[PDB]
A = this chain, B = another copy of it.
């Protein structure tokens, strides 16, 4: 036999960039405030898996590739 199995992954290519951010900002006054008292997630897989709990109270400004990846690739189970 000639069984062929080929999974894949997270191949990334950005290129160029020069994002320069935020420049030339005369006088501002950022006075943010964050205060949380909840958001308790959970997850209870039994047979299969790759649950992904996630909590945040951030400001969430993303420039390039701010992912929170979590991979689980090409699993198997026979129990012969």
Q: How large is the interface on A (under 10, 10 to 19, 20 to 34, 35 or more residues)?
A: 35 or more
Knowing A57-B56, A74-B7 are in contact, say whether A21-B22 is a contact too (CB < 8 A): yes
State the Cβ distance, A42 to closest chain B Cβ, in Å: 5
Determine the main DSSP class of A at the interface with B: loop
**Among residues 35 to 75 in chain A, which have CB atoms less than 8 Å away from a CB atom of chain B?**
35-75
Contact of A46 among B5, B15, B45 (CB under 8 A): B45
Can you name 18 A-B residue pairings with CB atoms under 8 Å? A4-B5, A9-B11, A12-B14, A19-B19, A28-B30, A32-B32, A33-B34, A34-B35, A40-B40, A43-B44, A50-B50, A55-B55, A55-B56, A61-B61, A61-B62, A68-B70, A72-B73, A76-B76
